[PDB]
Every structure is written in C-alpha cells, then in structure tokens.
Design a protein around this ligand. Structure first.
Ligand SMILES: NC(=O)c1ccc[n+]([C@@H]2O[C@H](COP(=O)([O-])OP(=O)(O)OC[C@H]3O[C@@H](n4cnc5c(N)ncnc54)[C@H](O)[C@@H]3O)[C@@H](O)[C@H]2O)c1
Ligand SMILES: [Zn+2]
Length: 286
C-alpha cells in the first residue's frame, strides 16, 4: 500500500487515502495547468505595448524587469496585478484539490503569488505564501516590515495610464521614508518585506511540520520546477530523507533528478496536472 499495476490517478488516490498527513507544495505549474499562463497569447494579448518596446519573451521576465522609471513600472505592474490577482477567475484544479484535501490533515506551501487559493475558497490559515502576493505592496527600500494594499489605486493606474506611463501623482509612496511602493515580491539581493502576517503563516507551517516529523507523511509537490527550488523542492527532499516513512510524490510533466537518499521514497506522475487532479478526485471520492 504505502510504497512508490495502476493508473497515475489510481496510484495518487491510494497514496492520499493512506497518508497520515499531507505537506503540499504548489508551484507555477498548477496555475499554468488551469490556463493561467505566463507566456504565449495570454501574455501577448495583455501587454502588446510592452512587448513591442522591450521584446519580452514572457510575463515572468517582464515582471522582474528594471523599468526606466517608476511611472513605467507601475504602468506594467498595475496591469499585471489585474490580470493575475484582481480579475483572474477560479481554476478548476484548485477546486478539485480542495475537495480531496477536505478529509486530510494538510498544510500548503506555495511559491505562487496569484489569487488562486482565495477565489477557490481555501482557509488562509492552511496556506503559506512564501513568495508574497501580487495584491500586496512593500517599501522599495524595505525600510520597515509592513505590507500595504489598495486595489482602487491599481484600477486607477490601469484607467489613467497612457503610453506605458502612470501619471506621477498616482505613484504610491511609503509613509515612513517616502520611497515609492513596489509589489511585495522576493528578490535574491534585497530579499522581501516579511511582516506580521507572513511570520504568522510561517509559524503555522513550521508547527504543522513539527507535528509530522514521523509517520506516513506525503510530500506532494505540484508543478514545481527549477526557477526557485530552494523554497519547496529542496526542503521537501530533505524532509523525506529525514523520515524513512515519508514519501515524495511530484506531479510534473518534466523529470527532475531525485537525490540518492530518497530514490526509494519517490514517485513521479507525469500526466497533465489538471486532468490528473480531476481523475484522482473522481477515484478518491468513491
Ligand atoms: N502563478 C504565479 O504566481 C507565478 C507564475 C510564474 C512564476 N512565479 C514565480 O517564479 C517562480 C516560479 O517557480 P515554480 O517552481 O513555481 O515554476 P517553474 O516555472 O519553475 O516550474 C513549473 C513546473 O511545472 C511544470 N508544469 C507546467 N505545466 C504543467 C502541467 N500542465 N502538468 C504537469 N506539469 C506542468 C513544468 O514542467 C515545470 O517543471 C516562483 O518562485 C514564483 O514566485 C509565480
Ligand atoms: Zn519606506
């Protein structure tokens, strides 16, 4: 039973049923599987002006670009926040996953910063947004550990911008140091503003892990790649190595080489995440 000839969905369903607890790591693949993609027509349709000017290949690259000024930065980011946070509809795979998780003891860690868990109605106390959220702002100088939000201003920036610039007076500023706000995002050089809410999520996640150091714990990694493996992928590998009774299951249509220590505790399921989660739900429910 607890081991790594069945379909992928059958195998996953059985493992979930058997597990004492689930630690679920969710990356960009899960949102891309529901159509919330960062390259191709979705990106091209939303940012024809920015693409024509800078020859951006994809939306992740664009979102990290050092724009000429803050007027251009906010012209891009306001539209980016609308597409991926304010107006992004619920994804069916997030609903399917939620139905499965209802009967399990679980916690989610995610590197995603979109709205996907909120529009799907997950309990915020069960989710750790380790890379922040696009709907939040931070001081560009990180002068104090507090995040801010104002969706009304985001809408005004979309409405009022022209020729890829927001009007000067709409750029929001840090009330402590007067530097411009930027999106709450993590950066290798500067890090990320990590406020009281962030630390509360982190503590909740860490408490869950402290409770499940032993037993049949399923570390379920969904749509996590090589862009930032230090957040979910590597820590999960280490957890599984540390607990001989744990399993590592990754839902990814690409194969990432698993370390020697956990070769016997690993399963890789390659089917398209959306279809896989859907078929697993159907089997699990019965
Ligand atoms: N939705 C978001 O919020 C978003 C989107 C892009 C990037 N980011 C940021 O950039 C980094 C991205 O890293 P990452 O590891 O999350 O993503 P990644 O792009 O590095 O890896 C995504 C993985 O999912 C797989 N995948 C994609 N579609 C799939 C499908 N239909 N079925 C099965 N597998 C599929 C890919 O093969 C890939 O291995 C994160 O740190 C994050 O903060 C966030
Ligand atoms: Zn400041």
């Amino acid at each position: 039973n607890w081991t790594t000839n069945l379909t992928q969905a059958e195998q996953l369903a059985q493992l979930i049923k058997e597990a004492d607890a689930l630690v679920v790591g969710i990356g960009a693949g899960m949102s891309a599987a529901d159509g919330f993609t960062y390259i191709g027509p979705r990106f091209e349709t939303a940012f024809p002006d920015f693409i024509a000017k800078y020859q951006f290949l994809d939306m992740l690259q664009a979102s990290l670009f050092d724009f000429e000024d803050w007027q251009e930065y906010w012209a891009f980011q306001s539209r980016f926040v609308a597409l991926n946070y304010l107006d992004q509809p619920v994804g069916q795979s997030y609903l399917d996953l939620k139905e499965i998780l209802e009967t399990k003891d679980y916690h989610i860690i995610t590197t995603n910063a979109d709205n996907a868990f909120w529009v799907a109605g997950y309990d915020p106390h069960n989710i750790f947004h380790i890379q922040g959220e696009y709907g939040l702002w931070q001081c560009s100088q990180h002068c104090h550990q507090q995040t801010y939000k104002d969706d009304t201003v985001i809408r005004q920036m979309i409405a009022e911008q022209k020729n890829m610039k927001v009007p000067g007076q709409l750029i929001p500023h840090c009330p402590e140091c007067e530097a411009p706000f930027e999106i709450n995002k993590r950066n290798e050089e500067k890090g990320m503003v990590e406020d009281a809410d962030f630390h509360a999520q982190k503590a909740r996640y860490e408490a869950f892990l402290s409770e499940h150091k032993e037993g049949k714990v399923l570390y379920l990694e969904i749509g996590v790649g090589h862009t930032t493996p230090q957040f979910i992928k590597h820590p999960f590998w280490k957890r599984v190595s540390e607990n001989p009774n744990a399993l590592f299951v990754t839902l990814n249509h690409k194969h990432y080489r698993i370390p020697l220590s956990i070769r016997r505790q690993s399963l890789e399921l390659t089917e398209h995440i959306a279809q896989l989660i859907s078929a697993t739900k159907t089997i699990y429910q019965k």
